[PDB]
Amino acid sequence: LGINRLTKLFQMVREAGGLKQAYLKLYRNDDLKIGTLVGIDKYGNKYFENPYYFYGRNRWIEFAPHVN
Amino acid sequence: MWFEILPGAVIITTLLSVPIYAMYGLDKLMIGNAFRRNMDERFSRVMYQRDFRLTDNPYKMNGLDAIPDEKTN
Amino acid sequence: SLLKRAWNEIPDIVGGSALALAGIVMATIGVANYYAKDGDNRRYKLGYVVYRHDDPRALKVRNDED
Amino acid sequence: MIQLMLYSLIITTSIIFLNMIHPLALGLTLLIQTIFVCLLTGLMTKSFWYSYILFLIFLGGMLVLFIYVTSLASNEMFNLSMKLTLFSSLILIFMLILSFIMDKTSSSLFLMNNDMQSIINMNSYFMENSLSLNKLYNFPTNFITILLMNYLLITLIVIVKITKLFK
Amino acid sequence: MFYMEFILSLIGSLLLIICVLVSVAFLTLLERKVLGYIQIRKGPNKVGLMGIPQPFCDAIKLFTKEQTYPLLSNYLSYYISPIFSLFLSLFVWMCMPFFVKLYSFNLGGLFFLCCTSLGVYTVMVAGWSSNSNYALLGGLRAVAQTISYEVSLALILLSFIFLIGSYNMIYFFFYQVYMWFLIILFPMALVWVSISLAETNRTPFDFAEGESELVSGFNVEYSSGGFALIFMAEYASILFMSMLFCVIFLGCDVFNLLFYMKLTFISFVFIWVRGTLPRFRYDKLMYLAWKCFLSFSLNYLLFFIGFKILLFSLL
Amino acid sequence: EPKDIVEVPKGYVYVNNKELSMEFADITDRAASTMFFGELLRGFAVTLAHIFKEPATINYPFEKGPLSPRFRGEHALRRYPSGEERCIACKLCEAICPAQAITIEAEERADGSRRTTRYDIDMTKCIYCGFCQEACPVDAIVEGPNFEFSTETHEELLYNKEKLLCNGDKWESEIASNLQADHLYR
Amino acid sequence: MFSIIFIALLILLITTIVMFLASILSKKALIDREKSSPFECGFDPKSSSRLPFSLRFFLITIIFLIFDVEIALILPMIIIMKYSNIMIWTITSIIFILILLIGLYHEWNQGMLNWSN
Amino acid sequence: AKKVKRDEIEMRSAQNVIFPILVAERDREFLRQLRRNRDEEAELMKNVPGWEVGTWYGEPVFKTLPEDTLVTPIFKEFYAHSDWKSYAKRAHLKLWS
Amino acid sequence: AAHGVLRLVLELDGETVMRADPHIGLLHRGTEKLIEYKTYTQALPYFDRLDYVSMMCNEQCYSLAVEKLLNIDVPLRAKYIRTLFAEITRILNHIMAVGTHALDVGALTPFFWLFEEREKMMEFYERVSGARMHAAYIRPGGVSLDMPLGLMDDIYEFAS
């Protein structure tokens, strides 16, 4: 069943900021993943890379919050 | 990952589970029993007539108390 | 020859045909077994059957268990 | 009430049937007629067994030929007339109110549905089709079924003899 | 009492109608998701939260979309067939079995044969109303497919009917009370899947609507609202067959969630075919209908008739 | 293996010479395959299995790519490290442009320098072939990496020099990266 | 039954109401000469397009009727089997199916579906 | 199948036990109602040209039957003085009025 | 299944097709005349447009024509690259044919599974030439440009 997978869910969901801060992220990006802050953009964007995924998923962006 | 499919199937199987439990709940509440006396056979129907005529509600079955209390002799 | 020829061409029909021959044989076995017990003084009778004592049907009623 | 309303619907559709001339419109009219007649015979029967039967043979399969070969279409579609519909609605309604007026019972058939048989009848407490269809198979009135099936076999020999005119 | 009886009977019918409609409309997503993962796609996960409201979104599009009615005077006749088809696909449900009495509906198998039969008239007149040779070929091919399979469908039923000893569907539960019935009639299950798949016109038997051979078959000349009704009608049909497969072969345990688990798995199985098989030819299917299935069904008929004779002999 | 049916020499492989045996085990195998659809079962289980492979959809526009440094996309007119226009109106880019999507008119700026007045590209005639940049002798014009330049109006696609210069200013950093990657290699 | 009848009437009325409702919900557009032509992949439809009725599909449906009626004959076997005399029910039913097979297999050797056209 | 035959027979065995009690309480109402039904047929055609209760203006409806032979009235006759509500209450019970 | 272009005027009896007149020419783009007006180098992409499913093989045909006229020969490394991409295009084309064919018959899953791998190959074209399809990579004097390092290895795993 949950072979150290529900644990990983707990990491992303909780440290997101709670039910609200996991749902809004999910609601906006249609997926929730774990990476490291590669660098903060000049325009509020935030870049995340994680070699755990593959090339399509390797690197990704969370756009500026004010873009609803 | 494959939980992706579960939301759908979980929803569909839920919706198709509803009606029976709707039928059960509405029966056991709003009749007195969860099952409506099936009337496929002649004998079931006549017994249904017999019940429906003894009292307006067949499902309001009359126990053995309906027997006359006593015969003096 | 014809044997493998059909069993190579029309396998479902060959398999189906063997099924049909199986059924009829056991069907004849069914009829035979049925009339071993005479099959007509059946144990359980539809409706409410009653006989006056000594009626030839009454003389015939099975006294067995089931 | 259902019985005489069903007469009324059959009457109205019958008037529709004799007017319509477009083959689809006629074939459509038969379709409705068949449902109605199945309903009606069912009511006066012991059960709806025969109604389901003739439904799937007459309507379900055999009216497919009629519509299909009458797919000539006239080369053009219907010019539906809301007037015969309105008359159909009009004739239906006062027939329907008369149906509300007509004598409740005497205007009904007298046939004996399974319910309208007496309680004592020990035969009526069997499977509804058991005793009716008994002698379609039990001797000596079952060979006629054999004649039916061979008749149908011969019917196919005939169809391939008529439907095989050089093509 | 008596009017308690009638009120509930109407509530149940109405309640079932909304559920089956919302289910099939919502089920469409499960096709889109599941097929998305058969193929290596991700499937719809965009709208709402993980594409859940995708089918509601679809309906809004359609009903907003105009009704590009065909040639001037066809308005009604083109507007009839979608009604007369969705009606069958729903109303066929009312015969489905319950322990909790919805009806005392006997001859349920006959009624199944009848409703499954009436699909021909809907598709055929629909094509005829469209008046476009593309639509017309689809109707004829659609008609031939359905009509051909009904022949095998009937005899297949009778094998089960004999094995249960009545036409009342409910007895499937009593006879399956110990061990499922698929494990007895395994070949029938494969054949019955094919028959059911042919009726609902899904692939590999996708000639009626189809694609890449006819643009959409009969469906080609259908605007939005009519199309939505046809599309819903087909999916109400695919569910019902999935239910019928479940009640025959797999327990008929209406008052057990596992039955609804089985509903989803079978309806999934239909999709599982959708994304795997290629399509048949016209003639090859007719061979498969007459020269293969009819022979198959007759043998089992002649097999089980003897078996029940032997069974009757024993008791 | 069954024997062949046509003897094959080398440099070829017949894909049907294998014979369909008539051995009883061989026919019954095929018969059982048809009676219980073994081959369909194999294919059936394959697709079940292949649900359990993770889909390869890029979550566009968040996740995205990959491209390569040579990708040919939006056009841009670069500027020297001082900021001066690189183009000198040598007009080779127009002379080579297969689609003839380039139009140029050059004169002398008041300083006396050979420079363009009008420099036009029609990205409804350009084929993004890159012959222009392969020809330009000073790397004045380049197929910048942007490719999401989608417009609602056809007129908005006909770039003139002002638009092209703006793209060069906007994308200068990335274009500098690619050229540093490919100049010695191109 | 009429419980079934009323439910079907109710559904059909609700069905037509829904489609009636969608007919008003969908925006209208000014009609066009060409928007209402038969779809022929975008090239003008030919003459009337009414298909020829020189074909076999009636022939197949006639085979349907023969077998469809024969199906009717064998439907009641389920119930009567408990009541009817067993010889007659046994032999009578068996020859039905047997004649069907022989008709089928004789007809394969005829091979009537493999028409020349 | 043995289990199916087991319980069905039990129904049928329980079936036969019940049945005579229904018949017994059935006969009394039949004879009671027939008494009343003849009374009204007498009391409603008081002034009719030649009315003869239980016959058609003289001659008996049935004659080969010996005397004191009771022939159950056809269902309609049994309801000859009844409303639809009564009539349907029994007739349309298969159809569930 | 008609490529979007083809227009068959068919005359049918029953359902069989008796007369089948194909009207090729629903796409004809006067490319022979245009090729005449332009220069050999300019004329090169035209060939890559033609038989657009075959990207590089079309160009190689044209480049060989010019080399035979100019009486020139290319170095071995250029030959091997041409050979390599000639076959990579062969795999591309045959996937396209199989996938289109699978849809013609009505099987979706094959087409999708292969079009996954078609993406990897196109990325390789993108790595060398800079265009997904419609490279200009093969030219009369050999290939237009050298190959980026490591593209050999990536080809190896893809073939693996």
Ligand code: SF4
């Ligand atoms: S080739 Fe370069 S320098 Fe010459 S005109 Fe074109 S952009 Fe200017």
Ligand code: SF4
């Ligand atoms: S990419 Fe090719 S077609 Fe486009 S402007 Fe440059 S040379 Fe002309």
